[PDB]
Amino acid sequence: QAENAARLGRQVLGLLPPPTHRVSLTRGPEFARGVRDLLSKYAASTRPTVGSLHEALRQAPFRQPTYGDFLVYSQTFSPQEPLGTFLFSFKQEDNGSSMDMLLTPTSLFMLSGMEAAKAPQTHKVAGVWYGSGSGLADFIPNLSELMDTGEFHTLLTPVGPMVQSVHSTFVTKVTSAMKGVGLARDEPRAHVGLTLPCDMLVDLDESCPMREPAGLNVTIYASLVYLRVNQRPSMALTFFQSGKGFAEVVAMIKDHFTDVIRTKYIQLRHELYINRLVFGAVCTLGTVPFDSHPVHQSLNSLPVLVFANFEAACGPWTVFL
Amino acid sequence: HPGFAMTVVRTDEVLAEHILYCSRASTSMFVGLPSVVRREVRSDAVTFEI
Amino acid sequence: ALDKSIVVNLTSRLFADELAALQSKIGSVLPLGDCHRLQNIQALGLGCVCSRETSPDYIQIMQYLSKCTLAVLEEVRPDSLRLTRMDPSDNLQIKNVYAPFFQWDSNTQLAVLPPLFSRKDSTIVLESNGFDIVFPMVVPQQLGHAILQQLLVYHIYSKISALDLYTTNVSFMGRTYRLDVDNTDPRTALRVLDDLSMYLCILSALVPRGCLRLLTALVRHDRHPLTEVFEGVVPDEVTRIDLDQLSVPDDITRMRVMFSYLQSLSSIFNLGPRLHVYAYSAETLAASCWYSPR
């Protein structure tokens, strides 16, 4: 039975942070032999083999993300998910000991209440994960007034993708990911990527070409737009995929939402409320490495993109207009 | 027929196969040593260079 | 761990003329297009967007500069250029040979700008290969802003003309300089001005009334060192808006929106990628810094 305990002697002492490089001076120049991962040009031969390069593969960078542990009502977080969705932590007031509220982008489409033609795919899918929209509106009574003065983009803190979720009847545990690549729980040695519905994502770089430079980086941006439909305030969340840098995309997002700016601001020739002037916000959901192909999927149908090698790095909310 | 006349210029392209003859010992060659450079390390894969 | 090296193949042996300029700038930052070891020379220059016969537009060139990766030279061999790479976030040596010279120190901040003073000085042409190479300029962040401040003012006052001492001269403590404007395409420099007309007239609508009444109490008698812009006379407009009575909870809703739109003016006055220098040697002209992400 100690052979099972001898396994934890191997794995725990094998998996540690690397210790500090500290060698006493009386030993001499032995410390230069203790520097291996800074060496990055390994010698090759006529016929190289793994036994020639098993030392070369042994140095690897130090990557460990920081997880988030959320305790959620089983009503808000729909019990079946594709295990890689994006999340949000909505926060109003600590009323309970530990109860937390989490919003998938299919769920935030239900609290929005926009027309069907803006997102013609997810409206059927998000209509069967939930009720008619009052199952989630009972928890936030201020959804009329949080849209008027425009405080809703100040109450969302972007979290990242899922990792694990153990589901019970009343209480659902959600294990999320921050800082980067979350380790997959059920499949060993796998990595959970970030999945978006194809309807919500709006690509930005698209050309005939009719040339743009390459890079290492492309940054997914979140967006959230205050608007009015049926003379009732409602929100609209879209995503962006671009590597243009922050100085361009703010001008590019204005060209996407041109009509939404125009149809709203016809109203304020009559009534000019300073609380109404706030329009939208843009966060930074973290970087994606270049030339990774987003792979289409199909779920139930619902087409869902996927991003391998996603890493998360949350940012502030800045008010664009 | 209007007042002027006119000439016309084209181009033409032919896929041709070719015989290349080379005399003996015309080039002295130098062959170095191959090395291995590791870079652009990510979480799903590691890219090398030889 | 990670390697960083770009060695550039080149199809013709360089002359001793053009090698002497490249030997002069052995520590220098130039952007390039792709991320590989081997690379053609047609990506090394910044002049794929800024050529001679093409009229350059320095906003679009600066817009170009945030996309690309940046690279530092190591050696100039007479056939192959050899460079090292900059990735966020990595500490690296940087050495300023840049010709309109400014002085740095430890704990300073930097930025990368297109050449805005002397193109002929800061670009060398390669007659052997026929392709020219354009070098950007590294600037501390105060003058990194203050040159872009003047160039936005200039395209405002060239359109009204459809003289030069007020529009083309970037001011600084101790020195004055000349911007290089002979051929500028204003259309990418005017879309930035098109968004400035959006933000600035919204900020003229939600103006706090008490902060207007503060200047009516200030600039008439209370003269301060940094209020010499008004020269002691109130503008005619400011007397018109202050007819209403003051109340606190009007301005509480206003000043938060005044606050929230000045968050947006970061996005229109952005520089390139920034460089926070922690240690700078003086007599060696070397430095050390970590490259920031965009």
CB contact under 8 A, A181 and B36: no
Q: How many whole angstroms separate alpha carbon A243 and alpha carbon A214?
A: 9
Q: How many whole angstroms separate alpha carbon A217 and alpha carbon A287?
A: 6
CB contact under 8 A, C2 and B49: no
How many CB atoms neighbour CB C269 within 10 A? 13
| Residues 6 or more apart in contact with residue C19 via CB below 8 angstroms | C76, C78
Report the candidate in A109, A106, A98 with the shortest Cα–Cα distance to residue A73.
Answer: A98
CB contact under 8 A, C261 and A214: no
Report the candidate in A224, A253, A197 with the shortest Cα–Cα distance to residue A317.
Answer: A224
Asked whether A287 and A245 are in contact (CB, 8 A), the reply is: no
* Among C1, C2, C37, beta carbon nearest to B49: C37
Q: Which two tokens stand for residue C185?
A: 């395409």
Closest approach of chain A CAs to the CA of C157, in angstroms? 23
Q: How many whole angstroms separate alpha carbon C80 and alpha carbon A126?
A: 58
Beta bridge partners of A237: A224
Q: Which two tokens stand for residue A238?
A: 């879209």
Q: Which two tokens stand for residue A187?
A: 């499949």
Q: Which residues of chain B neighbour C37 with C-beta distances below 8 Å?
A: 37, 49
* Among A40, A251, A287, beta carbon nearest to C195: A251
Sign of the C-alpha dihedral computed for residues C186, C189, C194 and C197 taken in this order? negative
Closest approach of chain A CAs to the CA of B30, in angstroms? 16
Report the candidate in C51, C147, C60 with the shortest Cα–Cα distance to residue A245.
Answer: C60
Residue type, C33: G
Report the candidate in C152, C160, C161 with the shortest Cα–Cα distance to residue C179.
Answer: C152
Asked if C263 is an interface residue toward chain A (Cβ–Cβ < 8 A), one would say: yes
* Among B34, B39, B42, beta carbon nearest to A309: B42
Sign of the C-alpha dihedral computed for residues C105, C107, C112 and C116 taken in this order? negative
3-state secondary structure at position A297: coil
List the alpha helices (DSSP H) in chain A. 2-14, 50-53, 105-112, 122-128, 134-137, 145-148, 246-256, 258-264
Q: How far is CA C281 from CA A304, C98, C284, in A?
A: 53, 16, 6
Q: How far is CA A131 from CA A88, A136, A208, C25, C212, in A?
A: 20, 8, 43, 67, 52
Asked whether B30 and A178 are in contact (CB, 8 A), the reply is: no
CB contact under 8 A, A247 and C270: yes
3-state SS record for C84-106: EECCCCCEEEEECCCCCCCCCCC
Asked whether C80 and C8 are in contact (CB, 8 A), the reply is: yes
Buried b (16+ CB within 10 A) or exposed e, C3-36: bbbbbbebeeebeeebeeebeebebbbbbbbebe
* Among A61, A274, A290, beta carbon nearest to C1: A61
Query: Helix C141-159 and helix C58-65: axis angle, to 10°?
Result: 150
Q: How many whole angstroms separate alpha carbon A79 and alpha carbon A126?
A: 13
Q: How many whole angstroms separate alpha carbon C264 and alpha carbon C252?
A: 19
CA A98 centroid distance within chain? 23
Asked if C36 is an interface residue toward chain B (Cβ–Cβ < 8 A), one would say: no
Asked whether C219 and C232 are in contact (CB, 8 A), the reply is: yes
Q: Which two tokens stand for residue C115?
A: 């050449």
Relative to beta strand A171-178, strand A41-43 is unpaired
Q: How many whole angstroms separate alpha carbon A314 and alpha carbon A222?
A: 10
Return left, alpha or beta for C67; rule: phi > 0 is left, psi -120 to 50 is alpha, else beta.
alpha
Q: How many whole angstroms separate alpha carbon C194 and alpha carbon A255?
A: 12
Beta bridge partners of A241: A203, A220
Portion 44-73 of C in contact with A at CB < 8 A: 48, 63-64, 66-69
Q: Which two tokens stand for residue A11?
A: 């794995």
Q: How many whole angstroms separate alpha carbon C83 and alpha carbon C155?
A: 37
Beta bridge partners of A89: A102, A157
Beta bridge partners of A174: A70
3-state secondary structure at position A263: helix
Q: Which residues of chain C neighbour B38 with C-beta distances below 8 Å?
A: 2-3
How many CB atoms neighbour CB C100 within 10 A? 15
Determine the Cα angle at A309 with ends B38 and A53, to 5°: 25
Sign of the C-alpha dihedral computed for residues C209, C214, C220 and C223 taken in this order? negative
Q: Which residues of chain C neighbour B35 with C-beta distances below 8 Å?
A: none
C237-241 own/partner pairs: CB under 8 Å, 24+ apart = C238/C212, C241/C207, C241/C209, C241/C212
CB contact under 8 A, B34 and A309: no
Q: How many whole angstroms separate alpha carbon A250 and alpha carbon B7?
A: 55
Strand ranges of the sheet holding C81-85, from the earlier edge strand across to the other edge: C6-8, C81-85, C69-76, C29-32
Q: Which residues of chain C neighbour B40 with C-beta distances below 8 Å?
A: 2, 35
Determine the Cα angle at B25 with ends B20 and B31, to 5°: 100
3-state secondary structure at position A122: helix
Relative to beta strand A201-203, strand A232-242 is parallel
Asked whether C96 and C294 are in contact (CB, 8 A), the reply is: no
| Residues 6 or more apart in contact with residue A266 via CB below 8 angstroms | none
Q: How many whole angstroms separate alpha carbon C133 and alpha carbon C135?
A: 7
DSSP conformational letter for A296: P
How many CB atoms neighbour CB A205 within 10 A? 13
* Among B38, B44, B50, beta carbon nearest to A308: B44
How many CB atoms neighbour CB A72 within 10 A? 17
Asked whether C25 and C73 are in contact (CB, 8 A), the reply is: yes
CB contact under 8 A, B35 and A180: no
Q: How many whole angstroms separate alpha carbon A56 and alpha carbon A79?
A: 45
Sign of the C-alpha dihedral computed for residues C59, C62, C68 and C73 taken in this order? positive
**Neighbours of C (≥3 Cβ pairs closer than 8 A)?**
A, B
Q: Which residues of chain C neighbour B37 with C-beta distances below 8 Å?
A: 3, 5, 37
CA B20 centroid distance within chain? 16
3-state SS record for chain C: CCCCCEEECCCCCCCHHHHHHHHHCCCCEEEECCCCCCCCHHHCCCCCCCCCCCCCCHHHHHHHHCCCEEEEEEEECCCCEEEEECCCCCEEEEECCCCCCCCCCCCEEEEEECCCCCHHHHEECCCCCCCCEECCEEEEHHHHHHHHHHHHHHHHHHHCCCCHHHHCEEECCCCEEECCCCCCCCHHHHHHHHHHHHHHHHHCCCCCCHHHHHHHHHCCCCCCCCCCCCCCCCCCCHHHHCCCCCCHHHHHHHHHHHHHHCCHHHCCCCCCCCEEEEEECCCCCEEEEEECCC
3-state secondary structure at position A105: helix
Torsion of CA A107, A111, A113, A119, to 10 degrees: -20
Q: How many whole angstroms separate alpha carbon A122 and alpha carbon B12?
A: 55
Closest residue on chain C to A284 (Cα): C294
Asked whether C277 and C288 are in contact (CB, 8 A), the reply is: yes
Q: How many whole angstroms separate alpha carbon A294 and alpha carbon A306?
A: 5
| Residues 6 or more apart in contact with residue C49 via CB below 8 angstroms | C56, C60, C61, C64
3-state SS record for chain B: CCCCCCCCCCCCCCCCCCCCCCCCCCCCCCCCCCEEECECCCCCCCECCC
Q: Which residues of chain B neighbour C4 with C-beta distances below 8 Å?
A: 39
Backbone angles phi, psi at C270, to 5 degrees: -70, 145
